[PDB]
Symmetry: D2
Subunit: 247 residues, 4 copies
């Protein structure tokens, strides 16, 4: 049985990824930072389906003196619990505005660049050094049309895109595939008022609806499968045509 | 049972795609131009497995006065035979050099632009007007790094990518998804000497091997499946990292 | 004194380019199809400032059995009149909708693909075989966000983008540079009502104004200058941040 | 008279840029880190040409508790010395390998990301808050074909690209243009043995030669000039077609 590590796999999309992989024979490591309770409910639920098929792992992925070691332990966790790690899904991501013109800015680049870019880099490094192996990074189809006010987040995601291709090429000799899935509009913020959410959905050309977590899980499932054995360094966009819409 | 049209489906990649879709309940129309024998052997072979599950259709897709009528009939064939058409795979493609510096150039653009770009347009146009509907175009991942001497072929493939995105947006309201699969190095020319073939394969970062028709068919099968129901206007690269390699 | 061919150079952007290059010592060949009067006035106005520094040349760039010969004569015209041709600006371009769902379609593809892609190809080809040489193609920055209903036009421009990169690479050894300028929103349709025009200008991030013909011509002048002597195969976007705006 | 800040402007490309801008009537703030000698010879040399036209400024741009204030002072330096800052050229850049498979990695990500992305972000942020204003970031045309072993540098530059577009959109209302120039093969490492250097030059399609520093300054001078008044959010590639070369 192959093992997979899902960062931020406690809720939403990450939760759907952890479940999907598990439904396919994967033993999963569910990482989280604060959604400890949601994490436990998922792990328990998975082990109830298959004893010893799911473990928990807590860790902050922000830039810090402890980030490099934290990433080392998160991967080490897969080996301690399952003796192996075949799949890494970089789903954990900090997301909020940081307007150029008027929490500290320094602390923002630390949390935004850490979770969306640097942690993934440290995780892949650790994953590759301890070795159907594949990595799947979660990108954002919309970063090409920068969301006003999310400057730092945009840079972070662009950097992650550079990591997907840079890693893809260096790990090819090691037979490790590195790809990405780029959602456009998926699960909306839970606090966001319905009328606002409805103004967002109406923008999606294909069905005027956001992508469900399961549809995103589907794409990831395809990329980790043997049906994508020749695919590496590619980004799979899942945005219902949203990026194609003219302003 | 859904029906699928596959242009240039008698041999190589088209053949593999036709077999893959058929194994999934699809009633396929095999289109061909010169490979009449191969087409008959494929249809017979397919019907043998399920009576009335395959039909044949001949037609040149080069630019001409007849192209528009020809593409209408090719789609009409699916309806006459199965009363429906749910999937269209634009696979047919002419491919040969057209060096800028020293068969008539006019006739070359007629054949290269017709099969790679204009017929697909007319086919999509007919497919949409006669309506899990989806179209899949066979692109080329290496066209961003122009193969010297294949200028016209390259322009055609770029037009095709343009069609993939324009059609995806115009057809979203009609619930028809339009995507593309972009091979990098797949089935090599049968007449190319083995040593030259070996020099080409050695360039592939992931395994130093070309993609098998089945690995290309896998990606395609994924894009027509319900697991891609939210995917439209995207190009799935299947090149084992080739496009990432620095000269 | 160097010579420059500007296709569709009788009015609008083409007109502005002919004047800029002329004010720089260039001897221009003003090509046109229907704008015979405008071409005569422009040529006279330029010869007035410098005798024998401008010539006229009529020719349809739609797909045809004559296209190839026409393109040969258009380049030959510059040699007949100036004994040389250093710069080719592919500005001529047909533009109008071709909706997938309901003038013959065949005639529309002949004109859109002819002027936007095939002619430029034959022109570049002729330009090269008869040789600071450089070619500048007029692309469209907004084609990445397909304008609903302009499907054929969009494909043509993508083909033109492919030609820019393919020609640049093939012609590097011949010391001929090949670049492109991609306007976003520039000279609006003269018949478009003011309010509609005002709605379009509002969409531009940088100044809520469209690009003036002179600003497009400035970019063109730079790429043909020696200050761009190491620049080939690149596309210079001049859209005032329009392509960055989210829908 | 306008003032321009040039990071890493003591030698090579940065030096060429400072001179060019100075030759156009610009008052320049020459920033450096260790090239203290070259910085002083450049500034005196420029002050000899025009008294009080050039000032010096030393600083490190790696991630740190002090980075934010260091960037603030570098911009402030322009106002103290000239009471204004119109142009900002982000040239400074750390460059070296960081192989995924076997100086600390944490330290490397701090210097590579700080100088190539984060510092630029704080400079732009400082430059905008204190306000023909434009920013020019130095990118890398080859980052799309990741150089094996430069994983971190590649991510840093990708992030720089996201910043160029993010900033360009957010600062359009403030009338500040943000663009980028992306060299391919320019000045080789001074310690690199000639034969290696020759092997690198041979790969350049246009002339088989690297871009001189002047050719790069030309592109930058153009983007800062009024001849690019409508250009923002764009990346100008200057690689002699190197990026088009198929491996
Ligand atoms: N949803 C959408 O519409 C879109 C999503 N995406 C991308 O898809 C992925 C999943 O998105 P979505 O489910 O909405 O994400 P969320 O923002 O809901 O969750 C991200 C998860 O990662 C965790 N996390 C955030 N910051 C850190 C940190 N510094 N260290 C460790 N963990 C952290 C969260 O905390 P905790 O574990 O405490 O709960 C959370 O569970 C992301 O990478 C996102 O960028 C892209 C486009 C659209
Ligand atoms: N093979 C590779 O390495 C790569 C392939 N691709 C793309 O994948 C797709 C499949 O490739 P591959 O199987 O090698 O293709 P082939 O070139 O082998 O076959 C194309 C097929 O389409 C048919 N065809 C060609 N011209 C015309 C025309 N004018 N009118 C009608 N039919 C025509 C052929 O004729 P007939 O039916 O008479 O035999 C042929 O069977 C193509 O779109 C190709 O561009 C992209 C990158 C790499
Ligand atoms: N204006 C804008 O807002 C934008 C323009 N662009 C691009 O910039 C370039 C210049 O644009 P613009 O000035 O508006 O273009 P126009 O559409 O006004 O003019 C194109 C010119 O080329 C000629 N032409 C059109 N079809 C043919 C043909 N089949 N054969 C010969 N000549 C033909 C015209 O005919 P005739 O000589 O008979 O008058 C016309 O003078 C174009 O390539 C356009 O695609 C891109 C984005 C935006
Ligand atoms: N040269 C080429 O072939 C290519 C260059 N480029 C890009 O063009 C730009 C200029 O390139 P090039 O002149 O070769 O660059 P160099 O690497 O020669 O110089 C970068 C400059 O910035 C300074 N610097 C380096 N690290 C730091 C740091 N951590 N903090 C502050 N300053 C630092 C240097 O130190 P000091 O002041 O001590 O001398 C140096 O003056 C760069 O952004 C580069 O990425 C892109 C492709 C190719
Ligand atoms: C598509 N998306 C949903 C969403 C949900 N969680 C995520 N989580 C992460 N990590 N990354 C994402 N891209 C992400 N995206 C979006 C896009 C824009 C805005 C946005 O404009 N937000 C404003 C609020 C807008 C309003 O309600 O008026 C803000 O101030 O944050 C919110 C969610
Ligand atoms: C990846 N590919 C295989 C291949 C085979 N059939 C195809 N068929 C079509 N429709 N489209 C393709 N892209 C295609 N590609 C290639 C790539 C380069 C050359 C090439 O350079 N060909 C030289 C021959 C090179 C040699 O053997 O010396 C030629 O003149 O045709 C051939 C096939
Ligand atoms: C940016 N642009 C200006 C412009 C004018 N002449 C050109 N000429 C050429 N050859 N190419 C262009 N891209 C071009 N574009 C545009 C963009 C959209 C529409 C457009 O949607 N037109 C509708 C009319 C919109 C309306 O007024 O309601 C049409 O049906 O033609 C027109 C001009
Ligand atoms: C194009 N380029 C020149 C060069 C010089 N200084 C720079 N400085 C910065 N800031 N950024 C750059 N991109 C840059 N590029 C390159 C590209 C690759 C290698 C490279 O492969 N370097 C090997 C040496 C290769 C060898 O000689 O064997 C190394 O280990 O450093 C060197 C220079």
């Amino acid at each position: 049985c192959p093992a997979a590590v899902i960062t931020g796999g406690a809720r939403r999309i990450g939760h759907s990824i952890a479940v999907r992989l598990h439904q396919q024979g994967f033993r999963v490591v569910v990482h989280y930072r604060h959604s400890e309770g949601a994490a436990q409910r998922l792990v328990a639920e998975l082990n109830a389906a298959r004893a010893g098929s799911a473990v928990l792992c807590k860790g902050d992925l922000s830039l810090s003196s402890s980030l490099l070691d934290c990433c080392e332990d998160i991967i080490d966790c897969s080996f301690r619990a399952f003796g192996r790690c075949d799949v890494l899904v970089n789903n954990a991501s900090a997301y909020y505005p940081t307007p150029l013109l008027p929490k500290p800015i320094d602390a923002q680049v630390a949390e935004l660049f850490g979770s969306n870019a640097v942690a993934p880099l440290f995780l892949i490094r650790a994953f590759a050094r301890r070795q159907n192996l594949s990595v799947v990074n979660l990108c954002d189809a919309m970063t090409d049309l920068p969301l006003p006010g999310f400057c730092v987040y945009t840079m972070a995601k662009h950097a992650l895109g550079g990591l997907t291709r840079a890693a893809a090429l260096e790990l090819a000799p090691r037979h490790i595939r590195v790809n990405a899935v780029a959602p456009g509009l998926s699960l909306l913020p839970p606090a966001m008022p319905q009328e606002t959410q409805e103004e967002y959905r109406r923008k999606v050309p294909l069905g005027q609806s956001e992508a469900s977590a399961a549809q995103i899980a589907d794409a990831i499932a395809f990329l980790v499968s043997k049906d994508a054995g020749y695919i590496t360094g590619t980004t799979l966009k899942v945005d219902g045509g949203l990026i194609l819409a003219r302003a």
